[PDB]
Amino acid sequence: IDIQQGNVVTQDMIDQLRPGMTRRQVRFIMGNPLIVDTFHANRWDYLYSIQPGGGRRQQERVSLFFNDSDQLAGLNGDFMPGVSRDEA
Amino acid sequence: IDIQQGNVVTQDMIDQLRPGMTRRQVRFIMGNPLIVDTFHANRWDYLYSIQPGGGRRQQERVSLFFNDSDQLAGLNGDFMPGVSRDEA
What we know:
Keywords (chains A, B): Cell outer membrane, Lipoprotein, Membrane, Palmitate, Signal
Order of helices and strands of chain A: HHEEE
Shape of chain A: elongated
Strand content of chain A: 25-35%
GO biological process, one term (chains A, B): protein insertion into membrane
Distance between the termini of chain A: 29 Å
Membrane topology (chains A, B): Lipid-anchor
Oligomer: homodimer
Number of strands of chain A: 3
Helix content of chain A: 10-25%
Structural class of chain A: alpha+beta
Radius of gyration of chain A: 17 Å
Subcellular location (chains A, B): Cell outer membrane
Number of domains of chain A: 2
Main location (chains A, B): membrane
Number of helices of chain A: 2
C-alpha cells in the first residue's frame, strides 16, 4: 500500500532514459513530472582530445550544462560507456 | 595539424567533473570554454522508488534537465555508480 495507483517511478524506468530524448519520450517512460520549472541555463562547449597528441582533426565535442544555481547539471558528448543512467 | 599550446582538453579533465560543480570549478579543471550559450531550460522533478514495495518515506529524488532543443541533457539524483563522467 502507501502509494497510490499510478505514481510509482522505478529505477528501471530511470535506466531507460537516454540523452537526446524529447519531453514526450520521457513522459512515456517516466509518467507526468511531479514538479516542472523553467529558468535561464548556460551551456559550455569544448573540443577535447582522446589519446593526447592526435591532432586537430581527431578532436571530439563535449557540452556542459549549468542549472539555475549555476551548478553543473549535464554532460553532452560521445563517451559510450554503455549508458545506464546519465549521472548525478 | 598540431594543436596550439594551452587549450588541450583531455579525457582525464572530463573525468574529474562532478555534478554540482560551479562554473569556477569547471573553469579550473577544463580551462576557458570554447563557446558559451544561454537559453531557457526546463527541469522535471520526480520521486522514485529504489525497490518494489518501498513506501512513501523510502522514495528518493531525481531531476531531469532539458536543453534548448527540448532534449534530455542532464540528470540529477543519487545513484553513486562511482561517477567517472556524466553520461552522454
